Amino acid sequence: MDCPSSTWIQFQDSCYIFLQEAIKVESIEDVRNQCTDHGADMISIHNEEENAFILDTLKKQWKGPDDILLGMFYDTDDASFKWFDNSNMTFDKWTDQDDDEDLVDTCAFLHIKTGEWKKGNCEVSSVEGTLCKTAIPYKR
């Protein structure tokens, strides 16, 4: 087992788990805590392979919402969307959305249906589930 438990789905070189945890999310760092609690961090897409993986995988193993939070945060200083994986956003499935100055009002969620993302950061408490991605040093 590369992954901690069987609820962890191994993909390429990482392990994924959805834990629909209802917690007071102050910032996306708070929601991302749900994952860090498991030694993981929020999901991070570097290819459609990941994007479309999560997409089915979510519903295939776990429940599956219409959209899962991406593990992407909006650094308002850089004004960038960043992966909690701490790696460059080298891939993106951005859909055409409405976008004001700040998209801090919204967060980034990958759409379970199509695999499209929304812009933002989850600085809202309305997050009850995040996908966690942790890499496995076993395959690193």
Q: Please, which residues bridge with residue 117 across strands?
A: 94, 110
Chain centroid offset of residue 126 CA: 15
- C-alpha–C-alpha distance, residues 63 and 24, integer Å: 21
Tokens standing for 40?
């993981």
Residues in the chain: 140
User: SS3 for 85?
Assistant: coil
**Residue (of 22, 21, 52) closest to 132 by Cα position:** 21
Q: Are 131 and 58 in contact (CB under 8 A)?
A: yes
Q: 100-130 burial, b for 16+ CB within 10 Å, e for fewer?
A: eeebeebbbbbbbeebbbbbbbbbbeebebb
Q: Which domain holds residue 27?
A: 1-140
Tell me which residue has tokens 């992966």. Answer: 83
Separation CA 49–CA 26 (nearest Å): 31
Q: How far is CA 74 from CA 6, 53, 82, 99, in A?
A: 31, 23, 6, 13
Domain count for the chain: 1
97: left (phi over 0), alpha (psi -120 to 50) or beta: beta
135, HSE (Cβ side, Cα atoms, 13 Å): 12
